[PDB]
Ligand binder design. Structure first.
Ligand code: NA
Length: 129
C-alpha cells in the first residue's frame, strides 16, 4: 500500500505514534516520506547484507528476522515480512522500540539528514486528525 500524507498521519495517530518519545506526528510522517515514499512494500538491501523493510525501513541487522542476515538479532520478535503489511501495526510497534533505544529518531539516518530541525509540521498541515 502507498499511503497518502494525511492518511498515514491518521494511521500513525490511531497506533499511538503521535508525540511518542516526544516526536510530533510530522517527524514520523517526514521519516516515512524519505524512508519509503509512504510505500508499505519498500525493501532496500544494505551494503552489509541486511535489508530495510516497510514504511520506516526497519533493518534486519537488529529488529526483524529475514533468515538471511548473519549474526543479526530480531529485537521486535517479528518476521521482516510483517513490516510490509498494508496494516502498519507491526511497523509502529517495532518503531516504538527503535525510538526508545537511546538515540531517538537519529536511528533513521534519513530522519537525521532530511527531517531533523526542519518545519516537520508541514507534513501534517491541512490533515483532519
Ligand atoms: Na535479523
Amino acid at each position: 500500500k502507498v499511503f497518502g500524507r494525511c492518511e498515514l498521519a491518521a494511521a500513525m495517530k490511531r497506533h499511538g505514534l503521535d508525540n511518542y518519545r516526544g516526536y510530533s506526528l510530522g517527524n514520523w510522517v517526514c521519516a516515512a516520506k524519505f524512508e519509503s515514499n509512504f510505500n508499505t512494500q519498500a525493501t532496500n538491501r544494505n551494503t552489509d547484507g541486511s535489508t530495510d523493510y516497510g514504511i520506516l525501513q526497519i533493518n534486519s541487522r537488529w529488529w526483524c528476522n529475514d533468515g538471511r542476515t548473519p549474526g543479526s538479532r530480531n529485537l521486535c520478535n517479528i518476521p521482516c515480512s510483517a513490516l510490509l503489511s498494508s496494516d502498519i501495526t507491526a511497523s509502529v510497534n517495532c518503531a516504538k522500540k527503535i525510538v526508545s533505544d537511546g538515540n531517538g529518531m537519529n536511528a533513521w539516518v534519513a530522519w537525521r539528514n532530511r527531517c531533523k530541525g526542519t518545519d516537520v509540521q508541514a507534513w501534517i498541515r491541512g490533515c483532519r486528525l
